[PDB]
Design an enzyme around this catalytic site. Structure first.
Site, PDB file in Angstrom:
ATOM      1  N   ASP A 230       0.676  -1.062  -0.098  1.00 39.56           N
ATOM      2  CA  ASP A 230       0.034  -0.016  -0.006  1.00 39.56           C
ATOM      3  C   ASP A 230       0.929   1.107   0.121  1.00 39.56           C
ATOM      4  O   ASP A 230       2.105   1.270   0.494  1.00 39.56           O
ATOM      5  CB  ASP A 230      -1.123   0.011   1.432  1.00 39.56           C
ATOM      6  CG  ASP A 230      -1.808  -1.130   1.349  1.00 39.56           C
ATOM      7  OD1 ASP A 230      -1.525  -2.060   0.607  1.00 39.56           O
ATOM      8  OD2 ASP A 230      -2.711  -1.237   2.030  1.00 39.56           O
ATOM      9  N   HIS A 232      -0.927   4.850  -0.262  1.00 39.65           N
ATOM     10  CA  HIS A 232      -1.645   5.756   0.582  1.00 39.65           C
ATOM     11  C   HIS A 232      -1.365   7.105   0.311  1.00 39.65           C
ATOM     12  O   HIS A 232      -1.112   7.712   1.386  1.00 39.65           O
ATOM     13  CB  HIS A 232      -1.899   5.208   1.881  1.00 39.65           C
ATOM     14  CG  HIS A 232      -2.733   3.989   2.028  1.00 39.65           C
ATOM     15  ND1 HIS A 232      -2.675   2.946   3.109  1.00 39.65           N
ATOM     16  CD2 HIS A 232      -3.814   3.764   1.695  1.00 39.65           C
ATOM     17  CE1 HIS A 232      -3.535   2.086   2.995  1.00 39.65           C
ATOM     18  NE2 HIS A 232      -4.575   2.757   2.294  1.00 39.65           N
ATOM     19  N   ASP A 258      -4.121   0.124  -3.244  1.00 39.86           N
ATOM     20  CA  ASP A 258      -4.044   1.135  -2.583  1.00 39.86           C
ATOM     21  C   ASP A 258      -3.244   2.216  -2.755  1.00 39.86           C
ATOM     22  O   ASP A 258      -2.362   2.540  -2.140  1.00 39.86           O
ATOM     23  CB  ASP A 258      -4.163   0.798  -0.908  1.00 39.86           C
ATOM     24  CG  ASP A 258      -5.564   0.049  -0.402  1.00 39.86           C
ATOM     25  OD1 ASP A 258      -6.363  -0.192  -1.454  1.00 39.86           O
ATOM     26  OD2 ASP A 258      -5.487  -0.177   0.772  1.00 39.86           O
ATOM     27  N   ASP A 261      -6.087   7.734  -0.831  1.00 42.10           N
ATOM     28  CA  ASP A 261      -6.825   7.965   0.305  1.00 42.10           C
ATOM     29  C   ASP A 261      -6.243   8.423   1.628  1.00 42.10           C
ATOM     30  O   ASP A 261      -7.289   9.157   2.307  1.00 42.10           O
ATOM     31  CB  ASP A 261      -7.784   6.868   0.524  1.00 42.10           C
ATOM     32  CG  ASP A 261      -9.293   7.085   0.317  1.00 42.10           C
ATOM     33  OD1 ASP A 261      -9.378   8.343  -0.027  1.00 42.10           O
ATOM     34  OD2 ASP A 261      -9.808   6.186  -0.129  1.00 42.10           O
ATOM     35  N   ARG A 262      -5.201   7.932   2.066  1.00 44.59           N
ATOM     36  CA  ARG A 262      -4.984   8.365   3.527  1.00 44.59           C
ATOM     37  C   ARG A 262      -3.787   9.226   3.645  1.00 44.59           C
ATOM     38  O   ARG A 262      -3.698   9.552   4.702  1.00 44.59           O
ATOM     39  CB  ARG A 262      -4.775   7.063   4.230  1.00 44.59           C
ATOM     40  CG  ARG A 262      -5.881   6.075   4.257  1.00 44.59           C
ATOM     41  CD  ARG A 262      -5.969   4.908   5.254  1.00 44.59           C
ATOM     42  NE  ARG A 262      -5.812   5.475   6.586  1.00 44.59           N
ATOM     43  CZ  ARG A 262      -6.881   6.362   6.985  1.00 44.59           C
ATOM     44  NH1 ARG A 262      -7.979   6.334   6.112  1.00 44.59           N
ATOM     45  NH2 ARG A 262      -7.305   6.802   8.101  1.00 44.59           N
ATOM     46  N   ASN A 290      -8.577  -2.131  -2.195  1.00 48.98           N
ATOM     47  CA  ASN A 290      -9.881  -2.085  -1.739  1.00 48.98           C
ATOM     48  C   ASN A 290     -10.500  -0.478  -1.847  1.00 48.98           C
ATOM     49  O   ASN A 290     -11.567  -0.120  -2.137  1.00 48.98           O
ATOM     50  CB  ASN A 290     -10.374  -2.446  -0.530  1.00 48.98           C
ATOM     51  CG  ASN A 290      -9.382  -2.044   0.675  1.00 48.98           C
ATOM     52  OD1 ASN A 290      -9.821  -1.007   1.355  1.00 48.98           O
ATOM     53  ND2 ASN A 290      -8.133  -2.179   0.736  1.00 48.98           N
ATOM     54  N   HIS A 291      -9.194   0.533  -1.807  1.00 48.05           N
ATOM     55  CA  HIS A 291      -9.510   1.752  -1.675  1.00 48.05           C
ATOM     56  C   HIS A 291      -9.808   2.438  -3.166  1.00 48.05           C
ATOM     57  O   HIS A 291     -10.168   3.713  -3.283  1.00 48.05           O
ATOM     58  CB  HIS A 291      -8.011   2.427  -1.027  1.00 48.05           C
ATOM     59  CG  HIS A 291      -8.479   2.408   0.479  1.00 48.05           C
ATOM     60  ND1 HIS A 291      -9.068   3.634   1.080  1.00 48.05           N
ATOM     61  CD2 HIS A 291      -8.140   1.736   1.493  1.00 48.05           C
ATOM     62  CE1 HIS A 291      -8.756   3.620   2.484  1.00 48.05           C
ATOM     63  NE2 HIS A 291      -8.242   2.400   2.705  1.00 48.05           N
ATOM     64  N   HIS A 339      -4.257  -8.129  -3.647  1.00 43.52           N
ATOM     65  CA  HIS A 339      -4.224  -6.987  -2.622  1.00 43.52           C
ATOM     66  C   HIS A 339      -4.786  -7.485  -1.122  1.00 43.52           C
ATOM     67  O   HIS A 339      -3.876  -7.359  -0.227  1.00 43.52           O
ATOM     68  CB  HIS A 339      -5.319  -6.038  -2.905  1.00 43.52           C
ATOM     69  CG  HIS A 339      -5.375  -4.750  -1.817  1.00 43.52           C
ATOM     70  ND1 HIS A 339      -4.488  -3.756  -1.921  1.00 43.52           N
ATOM     71  CD2 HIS A 339      -6.186  -4.539  -0.761  1.00 43.52           C
ATOM     72  CE1 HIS A 339      -4.687  -2.759  -0.639  1.00 43.52           C
ATOM     73  NE2 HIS A 339      -5.852  -3.270  -0.307  1.00 43.52           N
ATOM     74  N   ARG A 394     -12.999  -5.491   9.321  1.00 44.56           N
ATOM     75  CA  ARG A 394     -13.404  -4.907   8.034  1.00 44.56           C
ATOM     76  C   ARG A 394     -14.950  -4.552   7.952  1.00 44.56           C
ATOM     77  O   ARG A 394     -15.460  -3.574   7.562  1.00 44.56           O
ATOM     78  CB  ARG A 394     -12.935  -5.658   7.006  1.00 44.56           C
ATOM     79  CG  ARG A 394     -11.751  -5.798   6.739  1.00 44.56           C
ATOM     80  CD  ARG A 394     -10.647  -4.883   6.776  1.00 44.56           C
ATOM     81  NE  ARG A 394      -9.274  -5.344   6.502  1.00 44.56           N
ATOM     82  CZ  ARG A 394      -8.405  -4.321   6.639  1.00 44.56           C
ATOM     83  NH1 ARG A 394      -8.554  -3.100   6.832  1.00 44.56           N
ATOM     84  NH2 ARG A 394      -7.134  -4.862   6.383  1.00 44.56           N
ATOM     85  N   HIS A 421      -2.527  -5.297   2.892  1.00 40.86           N
ATOM     86  CA  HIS A 421      -3.952  -4.752   3.122  1.00 40.86           C
ATOM     87  C   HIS A 421      -3.782  -4.289   4.520  1.00 40.86           C
ATOM     88  O   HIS A 421      -4.573  -3.280   4.962  1.00 40.86           O
ATOM     89  CB  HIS A 421      -5.105  -5.692   3.102  1.00 40.86           C
ATOM     90  CG  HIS A 421      -6.144  -5.253   3.074  1.00 40.86           C
ATOM     91  ND1 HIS A 421      -7.230  -6.317   3.578  1.00 40.86           N
ATOM     92  CD2 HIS A 421      -6.768  -4.214   3.120  1.00 40.86           C
ATOM     93  CE1 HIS A 421      -8.374  -5.429   3.635  1.00 40.86           C
ATOM     94  NE2 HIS A 421      -7.922  -4.286   3.225  1.00 40.86           N
TER      95      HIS A 421
END
Ligand SMILES: [Ca+2]
Ligand SMILES: [Ca+2]
Ligand SMILES: [Ca+2]
Ligand SMILES: [Ca+2]
Length: 529
Positions: A230, A232, A258, A261-262, A290-291, A339, A394, A421
């Protein structure tokens, strides 16, 4: 003995009372409140805004506050009156020299008063800069009353922190005649916090998506390869990542998802990796994480990033692009690369192929599982857990167990599963070795160092070459500052300004280590559909 003129909303009784408190406050009975006379009150010396309020009230600019000014000042609060006054007062807090424009330095100093040492000066300068860039609609480099009202509603600078470039790169600067993009130049600009043009960005996004759209659901990738977890939106750590994992021009890449997003640089990560994808179609590979969907990017800050920078079309464009991302990779005919992980509905590699991938990820089904399945918390020490179990971290898809993985590894003739993940203190994590192979049945890889700026974790990437799976770790790198959710500095500060001025007036009444994994759990969950 001459009468005094003033304009206020107070009645004659209210003025007499305000007069009582004015007199008391006035020690040397000079009929004018002095800076020191103010700073004689119990809780007033530890209020960062007094300095400001006093100076705004001082309409005549003589240093002191006469009774008119006092009454007029206080009257401009407790107004209930039209919203323009509230705004008009707020504006004056920042505009120190009273010229009707907010300067960079002005905005910096005034914020600096109230923020104190909670922010480094480089950081504060940065958010001042970005706030202005967005807010300044005419180019002069200062904030008018009008520009101000637009933002809140909904020499003269402290250098040498780099200022973000105004020039938006054009199609000629980014693309060479043969169609391919200039990663050289792209990187240079994006690292400077520069932006492309809404046209150039859209081209990159769509030109890359069109390449993705043609790759199969399950890729075939050969060794040697650098595998990544990831990212991010930590664009500045991505630069390091490439330095550590080898140049994309001489090296094969597989990212397990991923990208966004973060972290506050998702769009840059996307533009760049998408640009690289066009440039090295056959050597650089992106999976879906997933993101990479409409549902999570609405919930977190990616949609928001795209609006602040560029437009909502760019967001919409990325969403369609993300739909084309492949789900998985068979690497060197040994490793399934996903992922998230397994699905009870995916027994063979051929099952991955039969899936229609070109949509928003459903809330359940093989698609979902591939992207969200996590391993058991006590994976490898299982006591009455079945192969697949409802994932409570989750709130969708399953937890898979060691037998589940081992079972799948045998049925499809594979050596191990590479996934990414879950954050990891060391940047990776190996799990229980297979009883027959002697090689880890499962590996997590995580490539975002010092996640959310707080986990203080190392990152890693897998470099598989010469029949060795080398895990190369790396620490994080500096990056520019943004306030949470790309809030401009006014929206941020105003509430504190509001609260501290009320306190001031109420002087009026004086007559009569990753434990952060615990804090973040809420966000590890699929959002509420
Ligand atoms: Ca006095
Ligand atoms: Ca005065
Ligand atoms: Ca000014
Ligand atoms: Ca302006």
């Amino acid at each position: 003995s001459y009468p005094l003129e003033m304009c206020s909303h107070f009645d004659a009784d209210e003025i007499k009372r305000l007069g009582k408190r004015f007199k008391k406050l006035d020690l040397d009975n000079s009929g004018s409140l002095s800076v020191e006379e103010f700073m004689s009150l119990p809780e007033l010396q530890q209020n960062p805004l007094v300095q400001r309020v006093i100076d705004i009230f001082d309409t005549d600019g003589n240093g002191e506050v006469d009774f008119k000014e006092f009454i007029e000042g206080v009257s401009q609060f407790s107004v209930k009156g039209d919203k323009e006054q509230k705004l008009r007062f707020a504006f004056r807090i920042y505009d120190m020299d009273k010229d009707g424009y907010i300067s960079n330095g002005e905005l910096f100093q005034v914020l600096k008063m109230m923020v104190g040492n909670n922010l480094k000066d480089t950081q504060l300068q940065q958010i001042v800069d970005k706030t202005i860039i967005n807010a300044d609609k005419d180019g002069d480099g200062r904030i008018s009353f009008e520009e101000f009202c637009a933002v809140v509603g909904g020499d003269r600078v402290v250098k040498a922190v780099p200022f973000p470039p105004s020039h938006r790169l054009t199609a000629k600067e980014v693309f060479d005649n043969d169609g391919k993009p200039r990663v050289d130049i792209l990187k240079a600009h994006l690292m400077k916090e520069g932006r492309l043009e809404e046209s150039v960005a859209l081209r990159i996004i769509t030109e890359g998506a069109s390449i993705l759209r043609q790759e199969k659901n399950l890729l075939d990738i050969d060794a040697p390869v650098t595998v990544c977890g990831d990212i991010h939106g930590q664009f500045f750590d991505l630069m390091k990542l490439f330095e550590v994992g080898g140049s994309p021009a001489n090296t094969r890449y597989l990212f397990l998802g991923d990208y966004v997003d973060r972290g506050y640089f998702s769009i840059e990560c996307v533009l760049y990796l998408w640009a690289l994808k066009i440039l090295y179609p056959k050597t650089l590979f992106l999976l879906r994480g997933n993101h990479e969907c409409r549902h999570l990017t609405e919930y977190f800050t990616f949609k928001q990033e795209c609006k602040i920078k560029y437009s909502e079309r760019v967001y919409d464009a990325c969403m369609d692009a993300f739909d084309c991302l492949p789900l998985a990779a068979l690497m060197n005919q040994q490793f399934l690369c996903v992922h998230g992980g397994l699905s009870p509905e995916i027994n063979t590699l051929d099952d991955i192929r039969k899936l229609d991938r070109f949509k928003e990820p459903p809330a359940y089904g093989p698609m979902c599982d591939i992207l969200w399945s996590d391993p058991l918390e006590d994976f490898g020490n299982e006591k009455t857990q079945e192969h697949f179990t409802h994932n409570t971290v989750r709130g969708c898809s399953y937890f898979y167990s060691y037998p589940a993985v081992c079972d799948f590894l045998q049925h499809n003739n594979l050596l191990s599963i590479l996934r990414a993940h879950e954050a990891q203190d060391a940047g990776y994590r190996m799990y229980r070795k297979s009883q027959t192979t002697g090689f880890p049945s499962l590996i997590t890889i995580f490539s975002a160092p010092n996640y959310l700026d707080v986990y203080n974790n190392k990152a890693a990437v897998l470099k598989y070459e010469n029949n060795v799976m080398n895990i190369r770790q790396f620490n994080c790198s500096p990056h520019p500052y943004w306030l949470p959710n790309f809030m401009d500095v006014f929206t941020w500060s105003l509430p504190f300004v509001g609260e501290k001025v009320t306190e001031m007036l109420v002087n009026v009444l004086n007559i009569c280590f990753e434990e952060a994994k615990g804090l973040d759990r809420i966000n590890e969950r699929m959002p509420p559909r």
